Design a protein around this ligand. Structure first.
Ligand code: ZN
Ligand code: ZN
Ligand code: ZN
Ligand code: ZN
Lengths: 262, 262
């Protein structure tokens, strides 16, 4: 009904549940994270944390295993506390072998009953390195893949993501952040490709947001990217930019409820 | 005074004055524009304008002097209609000779009584081409220079803008959009460099917005970037993210009132 389609685990968990309660939000799709800027005491510590997140988003940490496994453990432990309020996507190391990627997915995603894979943060130029994650999904239960697509991703990376969608048509793909500055191409590709959807989180223009959600009302998925975005402010923006209440309600939860079978 | 520090000319003008009125906004620093996506009815035309825009901001239109002479005439005529509500910045083509630069500025900026130069849209790697404009502003009334600093500017362009600030310490510089994904460096640079301010428009994270405005409460200038942003929405965000009402009142207008002597 309102489902936040993309938020990183927030601590203390009860503060986030209270923010959901106050915003009229039923459920959140939670994403693992190695980093908790929302708990940093003092500005120096916030910056330290934001600098580490910059490295992650830039793709410098992608082959690391243990940190992704600890963040899944955090994620499963958080969901277990509020299993009516949370569903989870778990992250998978990029740039491993097909064998090691499969076992990883089996142990850390399937065995934890997570509903999707992400948030992937490929380095620019390295989209093709995601093939084995698509392969696993093509086969075993078509888990949605969620891909960060704001900076540092450029136009050609968006195009390459599109090609993987076409090559693996049964695997749903959610494009993080509408493709950033590349939203015009992102919206064309999502119109064209059956299995490509767009996340709304981290829009930089309410006019771009208006154009994209009203052009693709059934394939845009509301998300806030907490702790980076604000739940009430983002909900308010969706409802103000939506051309009618159907569009608003589809983007705000009916689309992802349909997609994940919530 | 709440002042919108960065908005492009909106047509019809009375629509924009009404929005200001409803949002409790006293004045807007209005910036010229060659494209009007707000007057496009139907989606094909909107897309057509947004595309023309996307390559302006990317730096491809940077020598289309005719079109730009027309946009300044538009801006001067709009200002004349509500001279108590609007003050203007006028654009200057980026890559011209020192002589062709001082000629354009004299005719189009100084003669039209505009209070600043902008919004400049240098292509990535071309920040050094801006030197003539800094040189002229230094010889005229130290007119502020306002530079688009979201994509496609990268970190190195941001660093190069800072060097220009240091070479021209009396020329105020407003860094558009907090420097986008490069906001961590942008805010360090603005802390250290006397004449460098940050525009808040086109933030993509309210958390980033929060860190930046509370770290630099006296050098962040509220702007909405209409027609790309939404006045009421953006104001709400500033007030919600500000740590106190001083911070909010500075960012929302006192800062630009001081800098521009409004
Ligand atoms: Zn992301
Ligand atoms: Zn995220
Ligand atoms: Zn701009
Ligand atoms: Zn602008």
């Amino acid at each position: 009904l309102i489902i936040d389609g993309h938020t990183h685990v927030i601590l203390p968990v009860e503060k986030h549940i209270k923010i959901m309660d106050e915003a009229g939000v039923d459920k959140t799709i939670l994403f693992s994270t190695s980093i908790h800027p929302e708990t940093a005491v003092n500005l120096r510590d916030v910056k330290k944390e934001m600098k580490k997140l910059n490295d992650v988003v830039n793709g410098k940490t992608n082959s690391m295993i243990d940190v992704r496994r600890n963040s899944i453990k955090e994620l499963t432990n958080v969901i277990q506390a509020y299993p009516s309020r949370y569903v989870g996507f778990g992250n998978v190391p990029v740039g491993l072998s097909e064998n090691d990627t499969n076992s990883y997915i089996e142990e850390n995603i399937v065995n934890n009953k997570l509903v999707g894979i992400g948030e992937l943060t490929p380095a620019s130029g390295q989209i093709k390195s995601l093939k084995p994650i698509f392969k696993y999904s093509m086969d075993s239960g078509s888990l949605p893949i969620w891909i960060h697509a704001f900076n540092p991703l450029v136009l050609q990376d968006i195009k390459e993501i599109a090609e993987l969608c076409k090559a693996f048509p049964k695997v749903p793909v959610i494009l993080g952040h509408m493709g950033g500055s590349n939203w015009m191409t992102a919206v064309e590709l999502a119109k064209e490709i059956q299995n490509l959807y767009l996340d709304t989180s981290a829009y930089f223009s309410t006019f771009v947001l208006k154009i994209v959600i009203n052009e693709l009302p059934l394939k845009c998925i509301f998300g806030t990217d907490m702790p980076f975005g604000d739940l009430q402010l983002s909900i308010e923006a969706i409802k103000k930019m939506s051309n009618d209440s159907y569009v608003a309600n589809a983007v705000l939860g009916d689309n992802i409820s349909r997609l994940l079978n919530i």
